Design an enzyme around this catalytic site. Sequence first.
Site, short mmCIF file in Angstrom:
data_model
loop_
_atom_site.label_atom_id
_atom_site.label_comp_id
_atom_site.label_asym_id
_atom_site.label_seq_id
_atom_site.Cartn_x
_atom_site.Cartn_y
_atom_site.Cartn_z
N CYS A 101 50.21 17.86 -1.18
CA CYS A 101 51.50 17.86 -0.17
C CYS A 101 53.02 16.91 -0.56
O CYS A 101 53.93 16.69 0.22
CB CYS A 101 50.34 16.90 0.63
SG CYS A 101 48.51 17.06 0.52
N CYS A 376 50.70 10.67 1.14
CA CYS A 376 48.84 11.23 0.43
C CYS A 376 49.25 12.80 0.03
O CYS A 376 50.02 13.59 -0.16
CB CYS A 376 47.95 11.00 1.63
SG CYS A 376 48.22 11.45 2.65
#
Lengths: 390, 393
Positions: A101, A376
Site C-alpha cells: 500500500c 497502513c
Amino acid sequence: KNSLLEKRPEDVVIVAANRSAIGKGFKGAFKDVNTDYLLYNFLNEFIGRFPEPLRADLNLIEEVACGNVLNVGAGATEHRAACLASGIPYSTPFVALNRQCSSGLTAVNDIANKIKVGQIDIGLALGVESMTNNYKNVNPLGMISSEELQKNREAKKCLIPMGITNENVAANFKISRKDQDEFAANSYQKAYKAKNEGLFEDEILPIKLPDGSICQSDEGPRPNVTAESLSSIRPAFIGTTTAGNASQVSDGVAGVLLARRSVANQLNLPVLGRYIDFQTVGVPPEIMGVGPAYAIPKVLEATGLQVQDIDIFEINEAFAAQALYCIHKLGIDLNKVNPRGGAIALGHPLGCTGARQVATILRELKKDQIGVVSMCIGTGMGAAAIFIKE
Amino acid sequence: KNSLLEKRPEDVVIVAANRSAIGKGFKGAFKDVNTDYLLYNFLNEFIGRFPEPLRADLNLIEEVACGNVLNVGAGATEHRAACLASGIPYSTPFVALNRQCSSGLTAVNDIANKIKVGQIDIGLALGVESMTNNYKNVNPLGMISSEELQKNREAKKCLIPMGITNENVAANFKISRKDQDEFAANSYQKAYKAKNEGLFEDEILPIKLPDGSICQSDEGPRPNVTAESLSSIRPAFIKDRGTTTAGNASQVSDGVAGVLLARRSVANQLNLPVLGRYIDFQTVGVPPEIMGVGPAYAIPKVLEATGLQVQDIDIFEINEAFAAQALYCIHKLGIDLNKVNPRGGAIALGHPLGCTGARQVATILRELKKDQIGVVSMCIGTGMGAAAIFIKE
C-alpha cells in the site's frame, strides 16, 4: 520548527505532482485498459504540464522509481516501456518498487534519498495500479509456496486478508459499526463536496480511453451518503467491515517530479513544496491497520515536530476502523484529517495511493503549512512522510 | 584515491555478505523449491552467523530491501513472510525492488542511501530468484498489454529477447563466435578451478532441502570444458546465422544472496566486524536494443563519481549475461581480462536474475585483499547498466 521552515539549496523540492482520476475497479472508467496504458497516457499529460526547461530536455530526469503491487515483477518491463513511449529518454534509468500500500510514497522516498546523497539531481516518482486487470495475479490461496511457511506462525500472518486485519483492530479496541459508518459517510461527504467545487481539478489530469471517452472526474464520491444509509450494508469479511466502510477497489496512477533546490533554481523550475522526511516501521501483521499510529510518531520525532505542528494529515483510509484508531491513538484533530475526503470515498489503487496523496495534500496546504502523508501497509508496516507547502 | 582509502565514521560498511550455491534451473537442486523457501533457509543460516549483538536483537536491522524480477509483485508478500519466519521481527520493514538483472545490487544501493541519509543505521540487502518456478509468470507473448504500446517503436524495444539484443551487440561490433567461445570456455575454466580449490566455500551457505539432503555446491561449472568443444553448439536465437548459443550465454538458474550493511560508527559501537565498505553506485540508461553495453557506460559513471580510473581497480566483477556483450564492455573499457571474473562468470555459474547483483558482492569480497578496490557491474534488460565500487577491509 523555524529551522525546518528555512529554505536551503540542498532541499528536495517538488516541481509538479499530479494524478489521474480514480476509476472504480472492475466496472469503472479504466476497466478495459492496463497499467501500461495508464502510465503512458498519464505521462503524456504530466510531461506536458512540466516546466519548459524540462519538457525540452527530459534527459535531465535521472531516475524514474514507480510503485506497483500486483503486476508480475511489480511491472518493471511494461512501465519502463511506457515511459520510453512517453518520451522519457532511454538514458534515464527505471526501477519498480513494491512496499504494498505505500509503494507510491516509498517511490518518493527513493528519489528523495538519491537526490540527497548526490546520486541524481532530478528524479520522477510514480505510482500506478490496475486492480481490475491484476487482481487475479494474486492466487486466492495465498502467495507463499512452502508448506512449513504456510504453517509457520509468523509467516502465516502475511496471509490474513486485509479485511480481517481490520476486523481485528475493530474488535480489539472495540470499534463500533456506527463509529465506522459515521467516519465513512463523513468521508463521502467531504469528497463529493470537494469534487463538486473543482478542488481536485488542479491535481487531476485527464486520460482519454481507447474508445475515445475521457476520464477526469473521480468515480467514487457520490452525494447523499449517511451513517444509516451505510448501515443497510452487510459485512464483507466475517463483522463491522462492509463495502461501505472499506476503501474501494480502484485503478489509477500518480506522479511527483522532484529536484534538489539549487538545481531547480538554476533551471528556474517552479517549486510547489518540499519533502522533509520519510520513515517506515513494521507492526504486527494481524493488526496492520495501526501502521500510521507508529509511523507518524516516528517521522515527527525524527524531524522534531509534534502533532499540533501539523496543519493537514492525509492518512489513507484503508478502512474506517483502522483509520479511526490511528486518529484517536495519536490525538489528531478530526477536522484536520483527509479534509477533501479519503479512500473510502475516493478509492485505493494499491501502488498509486502514496503518490496520489502527495498530489492531493499540496493543494490542501497553504504556503508554509506542514502536512503528513501516512498509510497502513499489508504484511504489517506503517509509513509517514512530512511535507511543507512553498 | 588515498582519500578514499581513508576510513570515515559515516562510511557504509559491509558486516556480512554471503550467497547460496547457484542451482541449475528446472533440473537443479532447487527445482522444487520457490524463492520463499530459499530466502527462509538462507536467512536462517546468514543470521545464524551474525555477530552476537545482532542475533540477540534482530531489531537492530531497520530495513530489508530485496531484489527480485519474476515473482508477482516482485515477491513482496512471500519474502516479507519468509523474513518473519526467520526471526527478523515484524518491526523491521521490508521493500521489494525490481531493476531487472541489477535488482540485487540495486538493493545494496537502496540500503546504502538510507544509511547515508540517516533514515536507518543498519539494513539488509537481499537478492533472490527461482527462475525454475517463476519463469512461468512471464507471458511468452510479452508483458506489454496495450496494442498501442505493443506497436510503439520505442516501447516494443522492451520486447526484444535478451539473446537478440546480444546478437545486435555482436553484429554491430563484430564480435566473433570464436571470440565468444574463447571468453566463454575460459569463464568455464575459472569456476572450475575456483570451485575445486574450495574458494566459494567461504561465501556459500548451505540450503537444506525438504527431502533432508543439503545443497551446498554450485551446480553450473562443468568439468573440463574447452573452447573448440563449445564450438559444436548451434545458435540459440537466430537460426544458422546467429552467434549466441547456450554455451556462450548465462545459464538460467536459481540462487539467493544477502549483504548486511551498517554505518561505520554504529558497527564500531556494537563491535561488528567489517569485511569491507561500499563506496558508490551509479546507474545509466542505454538503448534497449543493445542493453548489453550497460557496464560500458555505468563503469565510467561510478569511476568518475569517485575520482578513480580503470587502472585503480584491482578486480572487476562484470556480469556475463553473454560473452559478446561482456567482451565488448571489457574491451571498450580497456580493462585487463586478467582482472575480470577471476573465479569465473555467469556463463559458468549461472545468472539467477534478482540474486546476481548481491551474489556478486559476496564474491568480489573474497577476491580482493585488504585495501584493494573492486567494481561490480551489469547490463540490464530494457536498456540500463549499473556499477558500484567496494573496498576490502
